[PDB]
Amino acid sequence: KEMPQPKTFGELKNLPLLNTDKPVQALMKIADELGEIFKFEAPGRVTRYLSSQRLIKEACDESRFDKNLSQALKFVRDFAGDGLFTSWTHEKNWKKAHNILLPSFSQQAMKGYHAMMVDIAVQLVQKWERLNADEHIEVPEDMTRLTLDTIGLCGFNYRFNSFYRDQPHPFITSMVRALDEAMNKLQRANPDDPAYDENKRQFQEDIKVMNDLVDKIIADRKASGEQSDDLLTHMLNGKDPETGEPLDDENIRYQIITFLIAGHETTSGLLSFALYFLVKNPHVLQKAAEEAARVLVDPVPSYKQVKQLKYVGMVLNEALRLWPTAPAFSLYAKEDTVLGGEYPLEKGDELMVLIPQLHRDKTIWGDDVEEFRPERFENPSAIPQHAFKPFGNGQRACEGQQFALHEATLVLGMMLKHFDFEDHTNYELDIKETLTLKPEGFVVKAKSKKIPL
Ligand code: HEM
Known part of the structure; x- marks a missing residue:
């Protein structure tokens, strides 16, 4: 079979x-027209875009693709x-960091981060309580x-103190x-x-801002010998x-930037898409x-209680189904192979x-793929394998998944x-794209239930 291609x-x-x-x-618009697979060429580059569970389940076979x-x-x-x-899967620092960071991102590790997550969550809630x-x-x-x-x-015990400012901390700005700049280069x-020489100067100084801050905190942490509940410790x-070695200081800095x-x-x-779907579907809210x-x-949520929020969890998964916020990931064929019995691939x-297209596959989800229905996720044993992939695949799936969901x-x-939340502007969904996706201009009003915090 020969594959379709857009203009x-x-x-x-x-x-x-x-x-x-x-x-x-x-x-997505192109996928809707061309179907489960289409070719997309740039100068010197070729990629094939996959949208059906039929084909993506093969792409997720790690014996065939990495x-x-x-x-x-x-x-x-x-x-x-x-x-x-x-990193490439076969880079030594991937394997080493993967082994070292695994128990830092496990469900058990979440018990350790919970207090710091609550710290910032309380700040967000107090901010909303204080609105006129x-x-x-x-x-x-x-x-x-x-x-x-x-x-x-949680990463390096550093407070950007974002709720105390109009202009973000300079690290965040950089x-x-x-x-x-990275997305723009695409x-x-x-x-x-020469038209980009200035973009380059600015890029280098932003990298410098990030490295100086993180390198300094690492160096001071090593010098002082201080210990904390963070990933840096x-x-x-x-x-x-x-290998029995720790990560070296430069890689530690990169992992911190990476988180x-x-x-x-x-x-x-x-969080933004979920709140959106909740105010658009009052029954679910x-x-x-x-x-x-x-x-x-309790005046402040414990780790155990968050784990009991089953339906909130379903709401989050149904928001990820419709608008997975890292909406695409890339694979290469490890050897010549034939995808879906129809599309020959070279090594x-x-x-x-x-x-987002996979999550809209009618052959998997049914007639109602555009509807927001958290109940799809009531029984996670029900979802076909490789149908739901907001966190990517296999050994290269999101390491942050438990952290993000918690x-x-x-x-x-x-x-x-x-x-209580009001969609006071009757907001019309407008999705901004950076490296990721989010609602842009999404605003609401929150009336406090006046429950002690
Ligand atoms: C809803 C939130 C999130 C989503 C949808 C998400 C999505 C993803 C996806 C799709 C990948 C695979 C990328 C690829 O194949 O190229 C990935 C990788 C990764 N994510 Fe997440 N992410 C989320 C939150 C987080 C958080 C909070 C952290 C850290 C605290 C994190 C850390 C990482 C890391 C370290 C990797 C690379 C893991 C590896 O390849 O070994 N993510 N993420």
């Missing part, structure tokens, strides 16, 4: 189709280095303050601008044109079960709110899993315990 533009091939504010949504570093990840590596997210009657909430903006601060504290056919003390860039935006996007009130009975060929469940639970 080409001569020597730029398909590249101009993604010269847009919303390239992932462009790709994680690929996409152009985006290669660009992000200029500041994320050989951290877990931007005239005021509203900028939802993604606050969710991002919350996730950055949480990752800062990180956001480095990510932006569209640059002529990377080295784990990495300073952890010996690889295979921030891989975790802050995806998780805040998730009421069910979630009832559970939160029922379960979070090294690139595949891109388009998660933070999102705690926070969404506390929000629904403490406030």
